[PDB]
Amino acid sequence: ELLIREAEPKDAAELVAFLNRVSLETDFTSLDGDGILLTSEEMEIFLNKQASSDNQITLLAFLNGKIAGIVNITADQRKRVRHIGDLFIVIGKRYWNNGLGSLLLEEAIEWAQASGILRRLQLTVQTRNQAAVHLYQKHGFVIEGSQERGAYIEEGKFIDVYLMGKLI
Amino acid sequence: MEYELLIREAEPKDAAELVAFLNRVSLETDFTSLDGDGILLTSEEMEIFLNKQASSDNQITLLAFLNGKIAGIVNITADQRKRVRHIGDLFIVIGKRYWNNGLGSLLLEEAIEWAQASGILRRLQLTVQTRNQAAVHLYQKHGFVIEGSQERGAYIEEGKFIDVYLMGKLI
Ligand SMILES: CC(=O)SCCNC(=O)CCNC(=O)[C@H](O)C(C)(C)COP(=O)(O)OP(=O)(O)OC[C@H]1O[C@@H](n2cnc3c(N)ncnc32)[C@H](O)[C@@H]1OP(=O)(O)O
Ligand SMILES: CC(=O)SCCNC(=O)CCNC(=O)[C@H](O)C(C)(C)COP(=O)(O)OP(=O)(O)OC[C@H]1O[C@@H](n2cnc3c(N)ncnc32)[C@H](O)[C@@H]1OP(=O)(O)O
């Protein structure tokens, strides 16, 4: 049983818990053992901001009533760049490779298309993170550049990232 | 041929003049995310930003005063998580009136030297509109290479999307 819907402030405590869990599952994102470093009350503030924002959104995936994944679009408000959404997605490791990430990413893209503001979606992905690269390409993201020392892992060493975007 | 030059780290006391300068340059070009709305920060809010930059070991704001007035700024910004703590996002702007006299280069080099000495930053980066060739040139001169380009990186002229270069330097 799977529901995908937009985050509500009542999800804050459980979202913080989810993000601290996934922070310990991999080193593919900026999240590390220090976790999300946000209180449930800070996260409420965040989720309210996202919900009222015309060019930003947090969508949550629930598996039998518990959050199993999140996709985030954030965006700057200045007119130069307000049409650009920066994407972030993470799925609980035990649920990988069952299509949740594609489901969530497709919902995000649909929302972004409907927004009327967002005309570009983008992100940075570690080149070694081939699952992410493949998923993003599958949904029409292209590799737009590659950057040396785009990330630091394992207490020394530096690794490369790709930049990826999709026009909408 | 006569002038007075000071280059130094910004202090909270500079807040009002720095707000004034950033509002000035935001009206001179549409080459950066600055626009006619201006910097959108009061002198009081800038004073906070400026305390943080001075108090942070992987960030900095450097000012150039020409004849006692701010003529240019270089800004290094950075996240604090260890995944990305070594990456400084660079921003430079010079008053149009003072372009092509070497001021941009002096500031860029000072910023690079600080970044090198910090012991934390191992990469500098920015994005630059592909049409902003003065900027593309200035950065190449100081060892930045083009790592990519992004369609719709910027929106101008109420309806025109344009491309940006991703540019980077290892330090
Ligand atoms: C800024 C950001 O978005 S953060 C970067 C992305 N997030 C992360 O890296 C966090 C950790 N990882 C995750 O949360 C997940 O593994 C995600 C988000 C990458 C993928 O979530 P999932 O729900 O597993 O995705 P889903 O099942 O829809 O699809 C995975 C696809 O990758 C493929 N895949 C899995 N592992 C690999 C691999 N090592 N190499 C290539 N492809 C792979 C699968 O075959 C599948 O493709 P298909 O549908 O064509 O078969
Ligand atoms: C993220 C960011 O940094 S923002 C992007 C940069 N900032 C901006 O676009 C804001 C508006 N522009 C400016 O502030 C300035 O014009 C800057 C910062 C780009 C340059 O600063 P200046 O003080 O003019 O730089 P400086 O005089 O040291 O060097 C200018 C160089 O570009 C050259 N130049 C000037 N116009 C052009 C052009 N159209 N095409 C190519 N080169 C040019 C000059 O010849 C000189 O190069 P050289 O010394 O090798 O001959």
Side-chain angles (χ1 to χ4, degrees):
Chain A
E1 174 55 271
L2 171 274
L3 166 77
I4 293 166
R5 64 164 173 81
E6 184 177 9
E8 296 168 16
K10 72 175 185 117
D11 295 336
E14 199 195 332
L15 185 54
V16 165
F18 174 74
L19 286 172
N20 284 324
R21 167 167 291 266
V22 301
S23 293
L24 298 166
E25 292 183 341
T26 80
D27 59 351
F28 290 129
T29 67
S30 279
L31 294 171
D32 56 26
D34 288 10
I36 194 75
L37 296 169
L38 285 185
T39 61
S40 305
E41 5 299 312
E42 288 164 332
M43 182 59 75
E44 249 172 28
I45 292 173
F46 176 72
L47 292 176
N48 290 332
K49 313 195 211 85
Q50 292 288 100
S52 25
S53 183
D54 60 342
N55 69 347
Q56 299 175 287
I57 198 172
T58 308
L59 296 164
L60 298 179
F62 294 84
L63 249 14
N64 304 319
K66 93 163 69 294
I67 126 168
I70 175 163
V71 62
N72 235 257
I73 303 170
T74 46
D76 260 49
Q77 301 306 318
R78 292 188 193 261
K79 322 201 197 135
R80 191 75 65 241
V81 294
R82 68 154 62 93
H83 63 98
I84 314 183
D86 295 291
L87 268 134
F88 173 79
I89 178 169
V90 57
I91 305 289
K93 189 177 203 197
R94 73 179 92 123
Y95 314 116
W96 290 351
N97 296 309
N98 294 281
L100 250 179
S102 294
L103 267 24
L104 267 177
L105 187 56
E106 210 20 278
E107 291 289 276
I109 298 173
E110 287 185 332
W111 182 86
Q113 285 168 324
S115 67
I117 312 307
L118 291 176
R119 297 295 298 284
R120 174 181 167 85
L121 286 183
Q122 70 181 20
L123 75 159
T124 296
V125 186
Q126 294 170 9
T127 66
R128 72 181 176 128
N129 190 4
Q130 283 293 306
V133 170
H134 168 82
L135 192 222
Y136 277 107
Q137 283 182 294
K138 190 216 203 204
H139 292 263
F141 286 70
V142 293
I143 293 160
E144 288 166 330
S146 80
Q147 299 186 314
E148 259 188 281
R149 313 190 180 159
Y152 174 83
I153 59 154
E154 305 176 349
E155 184 213 69
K157 56 186 180 222
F158 301 107
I159 64 168
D160 308 314
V161 298
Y162 283 135
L163 298 100
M164 303 189 71
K166 190 196 170 60
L167 308 186
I168 57 200
Chain B
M1 174 176 167
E2 188 168 35
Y3 65 92
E4 186 169 28
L5 181 58
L6 171 67
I7 294 178
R8 63 159 171 78
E9 192 165 354
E11 301 159 47
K13 64 154 176 171
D14 307 319
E17 291 162 75
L18 181 48
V19 166
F21 174 71
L22 287 158
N23 280 148
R24 173 168 80 108
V25 299
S26 79
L27 299 172
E28 292 180 344
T29 77
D30 54 359
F31 285 141
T32 77
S33 62
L34 294 177
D35 70 18
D37 281 27
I39 195 75
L40 301 166
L41 282 181
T42 63
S43 293
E44 295 68 32
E45 289 175 329
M46 180 68 72
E47 209 164 326
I48 290 154
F49 176 76
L50 286 182
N51 291 319
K52 270 187 192 66
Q53 289 296 88
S55 130
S56 169
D57 47 30
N58 73 342
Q59 301 179 283
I60 196 151
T61 300
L62 292 176
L63 304 180
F65 299 81
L66 223 34
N67 302 135
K69 298 305 284 175
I70 302 180
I73 68 103
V74 53
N75 215 251
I76 302 172
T77 259
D79 288 353
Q80 295 312 122
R81 283 181 163 95
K82 70 97 158 44
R83 195 109 314 132
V84 294
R85 185 153 67 211
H86 60 98
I87 304 168
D89 296 297
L90 202 63
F91 176 75
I92 308 180
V93 56
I94 301 295
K96 190 167 171 166
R97 211 134 299 113
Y98 313 100
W99 290 354
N100 307 120
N101 285 294
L103 184 55
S105 286
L106 220 37
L107 243 19
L108 218 212
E109 236 336 304
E110 283 316 311
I112 293 164
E113 229 176 62
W114 180 89
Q116 289 167 342
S118 75
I120 309 164
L121 297 172
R122 304 301 303 286
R123 162 184 255 263
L124 303 173
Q125 70 179 22
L126 64 162
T127 64
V128 182
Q129 297 169 1
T130 60
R131 71 176 182 145
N132 186 2
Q133 220 96 105
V136 167
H137 172 82
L138 173 72
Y139 284 107
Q140 291 190 277
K141 184 174 140 187
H142 290 84
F144 283 78
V145 303
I146 295 161
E147 294 165 328
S149 75
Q150 292 179 325
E151 201 174 340
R152 311 186 173 173
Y155 180 73
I156 59 161
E157 295 169 0
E158 154 216 289
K160 231 115 195 171
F161 295 100
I162 63 174
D163 293 41
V164 299
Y165 285 129
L166 303 165
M167 302 197 65
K169 185 195 178 76
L170 305 181
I171 51 184

CSV table of all heavy atoms in Angstrom, one decimal, chain B residues 29 31-32 90-94 98-105 126-127 132-135 137-139 141, ligand 2:
chain,number,residue,atom,x,y,z
B,29,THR,N,24.0,46.2,-14.9
B,29,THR,CA,24.0,45.1,-15.8
B,29,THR,C,22.9,44.2,-15.5
B,29,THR,O,22.4,44.2,-14.3
B,29,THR,CB,25.3,44.3,-15.9
B,29,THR,OG1,25.4,43.4,-14.8
B,29,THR,CG2,26.6,45.2,-16.0
B,31,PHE,N,23.9,40.9,-15.9
B,31,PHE,CA,24.9,39.8,-16.0
B,31,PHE,C,24.9,38.8,-14.8
B,31,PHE,O,25.4,37.7,-14.9
B,31,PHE,CB,26.3,40.3,-16.2
B,31,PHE,CG,26.6,40.8,-17.6
B,31,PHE,CD1,27.4,41.9,-17.8
B,31,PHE,CD2,26.1,40.1,-18.8
B,31,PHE,CE1,27.7,42.4,-19.1
B,31,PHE,CE2,26.4,40.6,-20.1
B,31,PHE,CZ,27.2,41.7,-20.2
B,32,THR,N,24.3,39.2,-13.7
B,32,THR,CA,24.2,38.4,-12.5
B,32,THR,C,22.7,38.3,-12.0
B,32,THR,O,21.8,38.9,-12.7
B,32,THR,CB,25.1,38.9,-11.4
B,32,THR,OG1,24.5,40.1,-10.8
B,32,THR,CG2,26.5,39.3,-12.0
B,90,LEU,N,32.0,31.5,-5.8
B,90,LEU,CA,32.6,32.8,-6.0
B,90,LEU,C,31.6,33.8,-6.7
B,90,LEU,O,30.8,33.4,-7.6
B,90,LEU,CB,33.9,32.7,-6.9
B,90,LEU,CG,35.1,33.7,-6.9
B,90,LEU,CD1,35.8,33.9,-5.5
B,90,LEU,CD2,36.2,33.2,-7.9
B,91,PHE,N,31.6,35.0,-6.2
B,91,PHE,CA,30.9,36.1,-6.8
B,91,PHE,C,31.8,37.4,-6.8
B,91,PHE,O,32.3,37.7,-5.8
B,91,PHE,CB,29.6,36.4,-6.0
B,91,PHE,CG,28.8,37.6,-6.5
B,91,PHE,CD1,28.1,37.5,-7.6
B,91,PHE,CD2,28.9,38.8,-5.7
B,91,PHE,CE1,27.3,38.6,-8.0
B,91,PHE,CE2,28.1,39.9,-6.2
B,91,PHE,CZ,27.4,39.8,-7.3
B,92,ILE,N,31.9,38.0,-8.0
B,92,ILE,CA,32.6,39.3,-8.1
B,92,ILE,C,31.8,40.4,-8.9
B,92,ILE,O,31.2,40.0,-9.9
B,92,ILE,CB,34.0,39.2,-8.8
B,92,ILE,CG1,34.9,38.1,-8.1
B,92,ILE,CG2,34.8,40.5,-8.8
B,92,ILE,CD1,36.3,37.9,-8.8
B,93,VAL,N,31.8,41.6,-8.4
B,93,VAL,CA,31.2,42.7,-9.2
B,93,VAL,C,32.0,43.9,-9.0
B,93,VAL,O,32.4,44.2,-7.9
B,93,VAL,CB,29.7,42.8,-8.9
B,93,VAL,CG1,29.4,43.1,-7.5
B,93,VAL,CG2,29.1,44.0,-9.8
B,94,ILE,N,32.2,44.7,-10.1
B,94,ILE,CA,32.9,46.0,-10.1
B,94,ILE,C,32.0,47.0,-10.6
B,94,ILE,O,31.1,46.7,-11.5
B,94,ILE,CB,34.2,45.9,-11.0
B,94,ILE,CG1,35.2,44.8,-10.5
B,94,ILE,CG2,35.0,47.2,-11.0
B,94,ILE,CD1,35.8,45.0,-9.1
B,98,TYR,N,34.4,51.7,-13.4
B,98,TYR,CA,35.8,51.3,-13.1
B,98,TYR,C,36.3,50.0,-13.9
B,98,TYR,O,37.4,49.5,-13.6
B,98,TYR,CB,36.1,51.0,-11.7
B,98,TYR,CG,35.6,52.1,-10.7
B,98,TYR,CD1,34.4,51.9,-10.0
B,98,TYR,CD2,36.3,53.2,-10.4
B,98,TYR,CE1,34.0,52.8,-9.1
B,98,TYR,CE2,35.9,54.2,-9.5
B,98,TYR,CZ,34.7,54.0,-8.8
B,98,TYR,OH,34.2,54.9,-7.9
B,99,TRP,N,35.5,49.5,-14.8
B,99,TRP,CA,35.8,48.3,-15.5
B,99,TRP,C,37.1,48.5,-16.4
B,99,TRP,O,37.5,49.7,-16.7
B,99,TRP,CB,34.7,47.9,-16.5
B,99,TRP,CG,33.5,47.4,-15.9
B,99,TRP,CD1,33.3,47.0,-14.5
B,99,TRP,CD2,32.3,47.0,-16.5
B,99,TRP,NE1,32.0,46.5,-14.4
B,99,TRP,CE2,31.4,46.5,-15.6
B,99,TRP,CE3,31.9,47.1,-17.9
B,99,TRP,CZ2,30.1,46.1,-15.9
B,99,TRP,CZ3,30.6,46.7,-18.2
B,99,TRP,CH2,29.7,46.2,-17.2
B,100,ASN,N,37.8,47.4,-16.7
B,100,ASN,CA,39.0,47.3,-17.5
B,100,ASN,C,40.1,48.2,-17.1
B,100,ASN,O,40.8,48.8,-17.9
B,100,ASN,CB,38.6,47.6,-19.0
B,100,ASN,CG,37.4,46.8,-19.4
B,100,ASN,OD1,36.4,47.3,-19.8
B,100,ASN,ND2,37.6,45.5,-19.4
B,101,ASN,N,40.4,48.2,-15.8
B,101,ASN,CA,41.5,48.9,-15.2
B,101,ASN,C,42.3,47.9,-14.4
B,101,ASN,O,43.3,48.3,-13.7
B,101,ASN,CB,41.1,50.1,-14.4
B,101,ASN,CG,40.6,51.2,-15.2
B,101,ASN,OD1,41.5,51.8,-15.9
B,101,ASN,ND2,39.4,51.6,-15.2
B,102,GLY,N,41.9,46.6,-14.4
B,102,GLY,CA,42.6,45.6,-13.6
B,102,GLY,C,42.0,45.3,-12.2
B,102,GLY,O,42.5,44.5,-11.5
B,103,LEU,N,41.0,46.0,-11.8
B,103,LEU,CA,40.5,45.9,-10.4
B,103,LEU,C,39.9,44.5,-10.2
B,103,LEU,O,40.2,43.8,-9.1
B,103,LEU,CB,39.5,47.0,-10.1
B,103,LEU,CG,39.0,46.9,-8.6
B,103,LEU,CD1,40.1,47.0,-7.6
B,103,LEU,CD2,38.0,48.1,-8.4
B,104,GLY,N,39.1,44.0,-11.1
B,104,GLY,CA,38.5,42.6,-11.1
B,104,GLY,C,39.6,41.6,-10.9
B,104,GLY,O,39.4,40.7,-10.1
B,105,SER,N,40.7,41.7,-11.6
B,105,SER,CA,41.8,40.7,-11.5
B,105,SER,C,42.5,40.8,-10.1
B,105,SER,O,42.8,39.7,-9.6
B,105,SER,CB,42.9,41.0,-12.5
B,105,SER,OG,42.5,40.6,-13.8
B,126,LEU,N,31.8,28.9,-10.0
B,126,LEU,CA,30.7,29.8,-10.3
B,126,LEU,C,30.0,29.3,-11.6
B,126,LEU,O,30.5,28.4,-12.2
B,126,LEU,CB,31.1,31.2,-10.5
B,126,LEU,CG,32.1,31.6,-11.6
B,126,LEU,CD1,32.0,33.0,-11.7
B,126,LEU,CD2,33.5,31.2,-11.4
B,127,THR,N,28.9,30.0,-11.9
B,127,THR,CA,28.3,29.9,-13.2
B,127,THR,C,28.3,31.3,-13.7
B,127,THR,O,28.2,32.3,-12.9
B,127,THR,CB,26.8,29.4,-13.1
B,127,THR,OG1,26.1,30.4,-12.4
B,127,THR,CG2,26.7,28.1,-12.4
B,132,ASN,N,28.5,36.7,-21.3
B,132,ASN,CA,29.2,37.6,-20.4
B,132,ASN,C,30.8,37.4,-20.6
B,132,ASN,O,31.5,36.9,-19.8
B,132,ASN,CB,28.8,37.5,-19.0
B,132,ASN,CG,29.4,38.5,-18.1
B,132,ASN,OD1,30.2,39.4,-18.5
B,132,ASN,ND2,29.1,38.5,-16.8
B,133,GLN,N,31.3,37.7,-21.8
B,133,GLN,CA,32.6,37.3,-22.2
B,133,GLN,C,33.8,37.9,-21.5
B,133,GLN,O,34.8,37.4,-21.3
B,133,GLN,CB,32.8,37.5,-23.7
B,133,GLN,CG,33.6,36.4,-24.4
B,133,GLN,CD,32.6,35.4,-25.0
B,133,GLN,OE1,32.4,35.4,-26.2
B,133,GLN,NE2,31.9,34.6,-24.2
B,134,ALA,N,33.5,39.2,-21.0
B,134,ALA,CA,34.5,39.8,-20.1
B,134,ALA,C,34.8,38.9,-18.9
B,134,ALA,O,35.9,38.7,-18.5
B,134,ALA,CB,34.0,41.2,-19.7
B,135,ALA,N,33.7,38.5,-18.3
B,135,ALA,CA,33.7,37.6,-17.1
B,135,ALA,C,34.3,36.2,-17.5
B,135,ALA,O,35.2,35.7,-16.7
B,135,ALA,CB,32.4,37.4,-16.5
B,137,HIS,N,36.4,35.6,-19.8
B,137,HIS,CA,37.8,35.9,-20.0
B,137,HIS,C,38.6,36.1,-18.6
B,137,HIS,O,39.7,35.5,-18.5
B,137,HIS,CB,38.0,37.1,-20.8
B,137,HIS,CG,39.4,37.5,-20.9
B,137,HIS,ND1,40.3,37.0,-21.8
B,137,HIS,CD2,40.1,38.5,-20.2
B,137,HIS,CE1,41.5,37.5,-21.6
B,137,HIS,NE2,41.4,38.5,-20.6
B,138,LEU,N,38.0,36.9,-17.8
B,138,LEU,CA,38.7,37.2,-16.5
B,138,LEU,C,38.9,35.9,-15.8
B,138,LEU,O,40.0,35.6,-15.3
B,138,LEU,CB,37.8,38.2,-15.7
B,138,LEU,CG,38.3,38.5,-14.2
B,138,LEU,CD1,39.6,39.4,-14.2
B,138,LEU,CD2,37.3,39.1,-13.4
B,139,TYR,N,37.9,35.1,-15.6
B,139,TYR,CA,38.0,33.8,-14.9
B,139,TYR,C,39.0,32.9,-15.5
B,139,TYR,O,39.9,32.3,-14.8
B,139,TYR,CB,36.7,33.2,-14.6
B,139,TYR,CG,35.9,33.9,-13.5
B,139,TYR,CD1,34.8,34.7,-13.8
B,139,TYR,CD2,36.3,33.7,-12.2
B,139,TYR,CE1,34.1,35.4,-12.7
B,139,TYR,CE2,35.5,34.3,-11.1
B,139,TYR,CZ,34.5,35.1,-11.4
B,139,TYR,OH,33.8,35.7,-10.4
B,141,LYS,N,41.6,33.6,-17.3
B,141,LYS,CA,42.9,34.2,-16.9
B,141,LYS,C,43.5,33.7,-15.6
B,141,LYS,O,44.7,33.5,-15.4
B,141,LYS,CB,42.8,35.7,-16.9
B,141,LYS,CG,44.1,36.5,-16.7
B,141,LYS,CD,43.9,38.0,-16.9
B,141,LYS,CE,44.6,38.9,-15.8
B,141,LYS,NZ,44.2,40.4,-15.9
C,2,LIG,C1,29.4,34.8,-10.0
C,2,LIG,C2,30.2,36.1,-10.5
C,2,LIG,O1,31.3,36.4,-10.3
C,2,LIG,S1,29.4,37.2,-11.3
C,2,LIG,C3,30.0,37.4,-13.0
C,2,LIG,C4,31.0,38.5,-13.1
C,2,LIG,N1,30.4,39.8,-12.8
C,2,LIG,C5,29.6,40.5,-13.6
C,2,LIG,O2,29.3,40.1,-14.7
C,2,LIG,C6,29.1,41.8,-13.1
C,2,LIG,C7,29.4,42.9,-14.2
C,2,LIG,N2,30.8,43.0,-14.6
C,2,LIG,C8,31.8,43.3,-13.8
C,2,LIG,O3,31.7,43.5,-12.6
C,2,LIG,C9,33.2,43.4,-14.4
C,2,LIG,O4,33.1,43.8,-15.8
C,2,LIG,C10,34.0,42.1,-14.2
C,2,LIG,C11,34.0,41.7,-12.7
C,2,LIG,C12,33.4,41.0,-15.1
C,2,LIG,C13,35.4,42.3,-14.6
C,2,LIG,O5,36.1,43.3,-13.8
C,2,LIG,P1,37.2,44.3,-14.4
C,2,LIG,O6,37.7,45.2,-13.3
C,2,LIG,O7,36.5,45.0,-15.6
C,2,LIG,O8,38.3,43.2,-14.7
C,2,LIG,P2,39.9,43.5,-15.2
C,2,LIG,O9,39.9,44.9,-15.7
C,2,LIG,O10,40.9,43.0,-14.2
C,2,LIG,O11,39.9,42.5,-16.4
C,2,LIG,C14,39.0,42.7,-17.5
C,2,LIG,C15,39.5,41.7,-18.6
C,2,LIG,O12,38.5,41.4,-19.5
C,2,LIG,C16,38.8,42.0,-20.8
C,2,LIG,N3,37.5,42.3,-21.5
C,2,LIG,C17,36.7,43.4,-21.3
C,2,LIG,N4,35.5,43.3,-22.1
C,2,LIG,C18,35.6,42.1,-22.7
C,2,LIG,C19,34.8,41.4,-23.7
C,2,LIG,N5,33.7,41.9,-24.1
C,2,LIG,N6,35.3,40.2,-24.2
C,2,LIG,C20,36.5,39.7,-23.7
C,2,LIG,N7,37.3,40.3,-22.8
C,2,LIG,C21,36.9,41.5,-22.3
C,2,LIG,C22,39.8,43.1,-20.6
C,2,LIG,O13,40.6,43.3,-21.7
C,2,LIG,C23,40.6,42.4,-19.5
C,2,LIG,O14,41.4,41.4,-19.9
C,2,LIG,P3,43.0,41.5,-19.9
C,2,LIG,O15,43.5,42.1,-18.7
C,2,LIG,O16,43.6,40.1,-20.1
C,2,LIG,O17,43.1,42.4,-21.2
